[PDB]
Amino acid sequence: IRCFITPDITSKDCPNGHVCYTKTWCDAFCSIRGKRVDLGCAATCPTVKTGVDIQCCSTDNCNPFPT
């Protein structure tokens, strides 16, 4: 599955890493410029740290950049 990788703008070829993921969390640099987001693909849906905010999915390019 092709999923949007970070810190690149673009989509890349993951032969079944079965998920596109969207980690999102608020740090110190955050009240201005926003939650940090590390996008990418992986074998399965990741573990969740407490307060960390997730979004898994399975459509070819289903995890793009918000604002």
Partner: protein, 203 residues
Amino acid sequence: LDRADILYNIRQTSRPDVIPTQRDRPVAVSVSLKFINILEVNEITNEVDVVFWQQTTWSDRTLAWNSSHSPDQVSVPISSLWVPDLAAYNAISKPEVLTPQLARVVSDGEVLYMPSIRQRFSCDVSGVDTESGATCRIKIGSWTHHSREISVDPTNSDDSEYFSQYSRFEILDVTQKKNSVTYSCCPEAYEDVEVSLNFRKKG
């Protein structure tokens, strides 16, 4: 329109001491102290040496420009823009500025000055070597300007997922709670934010 010609706009026609008034409407200032590192502590003299990012923010709409086919954000110097006359009421020492004095300015007139700061402070240090920890009050607000000229509002976030892993101390909980206070002459009230730094020693 290019970067250069934007700074040419701002530097030449915006006025360092002319508070961006929109008649009878204050300047919406959004402040925050994000605490980085607690350095020197003196339970006996109720003196703290601290370092923090005075995450400051506002709306100066005169600056604004047409960003459609142009750069959405540029970085301006402090010297060429208007700045809040903010001040730590319970301040001991002057502001030791670490970063370059620059602020980010968006096309929509939003302004982001967040300097890194070292400053000493008289506050409640009573109770550092406890589980509860000392609660340390730092009052800050405009010195000269009052509410209807400048309004200060504090703001989610794990306040101490960044706070240095490497300090002699560790942070427990930070609560920014605003405080509006009226004086006996003038329309309204000299607004001021009160940040509450609960902290303690490391094992």
